[PDB]
Amino acid sequence: ALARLGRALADPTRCRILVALLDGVCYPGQLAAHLGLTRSNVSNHLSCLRGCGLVVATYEGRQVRYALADSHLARALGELVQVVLAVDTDQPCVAER
Amino acid sequence: LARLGRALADPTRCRILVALLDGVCYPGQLAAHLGLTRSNVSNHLSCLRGCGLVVATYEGRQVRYALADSHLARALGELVQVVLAVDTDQPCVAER
Ligand SMILES: [Cd+2]
Ligand SMILES: [Cd+2]
């Protein structure tokens, strides 16, 4: 849903998760190598992401994995949102302000 | 990031931004594209300009409103693949 999709995709670590899952889908905490952040730290944000649907927790040839929800997010994130790659930044809100 | 996708995943603003693409004519022309009042639709632009997602221009006779760049017109215009985001009754938290 719109008010889940946008809050989970426009987030510091979760944008970084979702794009590193594209080149990942290994094991629980594998994103720690992709991000440099602890396997504790990165898994915290997945406890939102699996509820927002955006990641699907699966099994592979020997262990459990976290994949993007479908080809859907793997494609639309893989074009890149084009906004220079959204990062956290000190820019304000409201027009003319 | 946190200005971008808060204004990009909003009820009327996703609707503005996709209707701007097929419009960019005049202030409140979006009222025809959305079926919503020219005041009501313009209220949301008072965020959208500050969030950087829209820029005001001039054309051959009046002022216009356009998407920030080709950047948002392309990534919106592929379609974000999420079935077209609309307000929908779906929850949060994993395993819950
Ligand atoms: Cd969530
Ligand atoms: Cd704003």
Swiss-Prot record, chain A:
Superkingdom of source: Bacteria
The Gene Ontology terms for molecular function here are: cadmium ion binding; cadmium ion sensor activity; DNA binding; DNA-binding transcription factor activity; lead ion binding
Q: What does the UniProt entry list as the effect of changing residue 48 to S?
A: Abolishes metal-induced derepression
Question: From which residue to which does any coiled coil extend?
Answer: none
Domain HTH arsR-type intervals: 1-88
Question: Which residues take part in binding Cd(2+)?
Answer: 48, 52, 93
Q: What's one GO BP annotation on this UniProt entry?
A: regulation of gene expression
Q: What are the UniProt keywords, alphabetically? A: Cadmium, DNA-binding, Metal-binding, Transcription, Transcription regulation
According to its UniProt entry, what is the function of this protein?
A: Metal-responsive transcriptional repressor for the cmt operon. Binding of cadmium or lead causes the repressor to dissociate from the DNA.
Q: How does it assemble?
A: Homodimer.
Supply the name of the protein.
Answer: HTH-type transcriptional regulator CmtR
Native organism is Mycobacterium tuberculosis (strain ATCC 25618 / H37Rv)
Q: Which residues of the full protein are shown?
A: 10 to 106 of 118
